[PDB]
Amino acid sequence: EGYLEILSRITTEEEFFSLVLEICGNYGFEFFSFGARAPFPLTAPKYHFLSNYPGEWKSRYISEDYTSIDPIVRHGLLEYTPLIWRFFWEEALHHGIRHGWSIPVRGKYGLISMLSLVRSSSIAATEILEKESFLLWITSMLQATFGDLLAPRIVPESNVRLTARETEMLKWTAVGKTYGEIGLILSIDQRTVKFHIVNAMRKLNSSNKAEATMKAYAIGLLN
């Protein structure tokens, strides 16, 4: 092999863009789509994805906000297994996107990501059961680097540090404890509980303790 060596060197979007464009081809593919859904906000999480799909297709996919209906994408949220694969489908087919393999991997900071390698001429148990275990391997290492790149812009809270105390205040808040209940549990004063929470809210750029707690959890800060 020789990819961890390329990655440990890669430090930009294009370097990632072209490092996948080569893997795309070196395994018989023309289209590639690496996507990543942030955990925030909960009510409309924001995806981020580079590709090489037809320009006309990129723009229209956004236009109608297809992320909220795309089955290739819904899978990447409920299932942890790879997937060899409505006027929506019709609108796509006629662009060169009908034959492709999507690989969903969970990553740091609660990021849910997917490598969807598509081609313009399908399934092959002798090609799948042949590259199956690699494709998956590549994907995990792709997402690792990809997150280390996106986390900055995409999950700005990723470099948040949480004091021991704040971590413990957030955990008891995750379970719905009032400032008063936490004190009796921790044998500590009330203004004390509020103090630490209020600090974490700020670092975590949240309007309130529930949003904070949720953001902290969603990122692994309470793990």
Ligand X SMILES: CCCCCCCCCC(=O)CC(=O)N[C@H]1CCOC1=O
By CB under 8 A, name the binding residues for its own copies. Answer: 1, 37, 39, 41-43, 45, 77-81, 106-108, 112, 129, 132-134, 136-137, 140-141, 144, 171-176, 206-211, 213-214, 217-218, 220, 222-223
Q: How far is the CB of 78 from Na ion (least distance, A)?
A: 23
- With vertex at residue 221, the alpha carbon angle to CA 187 and CA 135, rounded to the nearest 5 degrees, is 155
Place of tokens 């990447």: 76
When CB distances are held under 5 to 8 angstroms depending on the partner's kind, the choice from ligand X, its own copies, Na ion, none that residue 114 binds is ligand X
Contact 39, 151 (CB under 8 A): no
Could you give the string, one character per residue 24-43, with x where binding to ligand X holds by CB under 6 A and - elsewhere? ---------x-xxx------
Q: Does 70 bind ligand X (CB under 6 A)?
A: yes
In the bound state with its own copies, the residue whose beta carbon lies nearer, of 59 and 71, is 71
Q: How far is the CB of 121 from its own copies (least distance, A)?
A: 26
- Supply the minimum distance, in Å, between the C-beta of residue 5 and Na ion: 26
Residue 105 pairs in a beta bridge with: 113
In the list 6, 48, 70, 84, the residue contacting Na ion (rule: CB under 5 A) is 48
With b for 16 or more beta-carbon neighbours within 10 A and e for fewer, the 147-158 pattern comes to: bbbbbeebbebb
Determine the angle formed by the axes of helices 125-154 and 13-25, rounding to 10 degrees: 180
- How far CA 119 is from CA of 52, 64, 73, 157, 167, in Å, comes to 11, 23, 17, 36, 46
